[PDB]
């Protein structure tokens, strides 16, 4: 962070490695990662980054994905990330006016690798998920989208997904109802006209 | 409502 | 037919006659009626369309369809209206006037593409398994099941991305479970060509 | 927060992105988030706010409801909720004497949407809560209070709930005793009443 | 635009006499001078045998990446008339010098087409 | 990509 | 930390102990000491290691394994271990254009002693771990590679570990298809090939 670079709390470093060491990699490390690091400088995220080194293969699919953009860049490409550039010119392009954010584009590229590695370690893909005989319908959907922000496809299949494959995998005593209720239902409709069954 | 419902098609009102 | 009106032949009729009542409402009607039609004026397209001797229930959704068509239209123009495209109250001299004119309105063209859009959800109605019950059966040769699958996709409605995406991930994941192995195994890149010629001898 | 602006403190993201991304919007979510973002400037609450995004379908209940009081608003409603208006901005409305508070109005708005969305969440209907055989009464009333405070009726409805619905439903070793204790019974005298049973 | 009595004949053989070596020169009988919407019209008609029809599809949009790799101007797209006027194909076609569109495309699928073959 | 899978020859983008 | 010297705050020691009492030594121990103790001075560093006393036999192992390091390193051993420095002098050599990094330092001798007390602690040699007839691909390999970040072999080795032995223990139905993949095939084609098996 700037107040003149200062750095991580060391009890904030504690909490992102206990979300690499303990979460596998579930598809909500995104979020905390995006909020642990924010306002942060370039070099500063370099050292949370030595925490995912536990991972060899882990760590190799973000060295990837970085060098593609460095290079893809061309503050050069080495510079922004860090590998070149010192903290004090890091800040001078942040505290800048109009600013150059330096910071906010490498916390871009990283969450791309993590988009990357969370793919890997997915549990199941979608087509797999079916809802359980006695499996209350609100407890299915959650499960659904969990798996859904994970398997990471454009925008508009994620759509048609929501709308029929949602309703296809149901269990038959509730298909009879979300079927009933008509196409293009919003989700706010689905779970009320199933709240109890 | 252009055509109603077993009129021809194209048949004048 | 314009060249002046001219008349549509009786072996264009009779073919398009033939079409609708042998080939049920399988896809193909959709570009084989468009081959029927070129340059055809909308009292032409009433002639040709009420030909049609059976499925006639089907027939009428597409007279629906029509309607809302023309309503929205409606809507569009507070110069042919709604009803004038469907030739319901213009003349044929009118409807040849408009479409000769410098620049020509293309009445023809718009109620063309008006019935295609209701051959469409004809069609879709008319499919008779969704995309995503395609099953390969045990012993089902491979080629048979490609084939099935594509027929129905090919039945089936969405934007060109959730197409895309069926190509590339449905296929596979519900092979039989002899292919399903070699499938995943040739990798994401693969053309079609290389996966049917790999299971070919099962 | 305001000390100036001051950014919220990387931790406290954390906090709350914790609470979304695990309490499946249980009916505890809005006094959490009443919570860490206390004395919020509009612009911080927007920074929390890019966290439900993870859920497309939850994260649009809020742009409609957030909308609507936009336009019943008519700082216009498009610089409250700190689309158009800048941070020096907000401050100047919250930093006066005397103060037209922003950053409590929004919040506000988003614990109505947040509302909508715990009902929508809500495991089952009020009406089918029924006490156990052996389920002791000191739990049943919390698991009856916790649903309560989701389906969020009037005033007026949720004490005829608790005062009749309540006993009606409790089993009939229980219902003797609760009924036996009279009408109007405060909710002290029926707990004390069947300590043990 | 082609006579029904032709593109029936095209249907039926393709139905009848499934898919064989004789049906590639076959194809060339039916195609002369044919506009690229002419070429399209002729092979969506097809209602069986799908999956050959993805094959060649496939084929041409190899052949049309070559193309346009390899190079108004026809553009990659251009020649298969996916994105293209019925009134600039007449131009092309009738300006002076010819370029063959309905050539190269008649090319593609025949090359497709032997590949079908080569399958069965 | 002048055709992605499942779309009519000719068909315009 | 520096500031003049800071002294470590009292919450972060007690996560620091959470460590240890409850961790039993697990592979992650490394991770959250390299975090929790960044950026102090040599003098902080044997503060929390008065918690790691409480176990007579690990304690040991690490005043054997600094011993080493100190004659090793003949600011004498003695003094960078903070054993007979004084807390000024140890910010001197740390404030210094350019720096003698003396935290740093220390902090490398201590992880080679908890990588020594680690692979004690390791539950099961990495020849003795088998995939489960039903159990996930997925969960297979966090739980493989949290004891190869044990074993804790030189870096050669390992490759061969994760490139031939994890194959090897396999289960017989997942054995043929990664197999089946090729030599030499990257850990993310593994995952994927055996997603839903």
Chains 1, 4, 7 share one sequence.
Not at chain 1, 144 to 158: D, G, I, P
Not at chain 2, 1 to 13: A, R
Request: aromatic share 8%; net charge negative; with cysteine.
């Amino acid at each position: 962070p700037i107040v003149v670079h200062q750095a991580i709390s060391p009890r904030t470093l504690n909490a992102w490695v206990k979300v690499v060491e303990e979460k596998a990699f579930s598809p909500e490390v995104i979020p905390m990662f995006s909020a642990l690091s924010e306002g942060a400088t370039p070099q500063d995220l370099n050292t949370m980054l030595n925490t995912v080194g536990g991972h060899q293969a882990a760590m190799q699919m973000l060295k990837e994905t970085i060098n593609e953009e460095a290079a893809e860049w061309d503050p050069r490409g080495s510079d922004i990330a860090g590998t070149t550039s010192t903290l004090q010119e890091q800040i001078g392009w942040m505290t800048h006016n109009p600013p150059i954010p330096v910071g906010e584009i490498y916390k871009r590229w990283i969450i791309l690798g993590l988009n990357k590695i969370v793919r890997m370690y997915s549990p199941t893909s979608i087509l797999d998920i079916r809802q359980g005989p006695k499996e209350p319908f609100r407890d299915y959907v959650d499960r659904f989208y969990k798996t859904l922000r994970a398997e990471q496809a454009s925008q508009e299949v994620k759509n048609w997904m929501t709308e029929t494959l949602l309703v296809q995998n149901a269990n038959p005593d509730c298909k009879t109802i979300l079927k009933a209720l008509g196409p293009g239902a919003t989700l706010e409709e689905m779970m009320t006209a199933c709240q109890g069954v | 409502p252009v055509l109603f419902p077993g009129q021809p098609f194209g048949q004048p009102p």
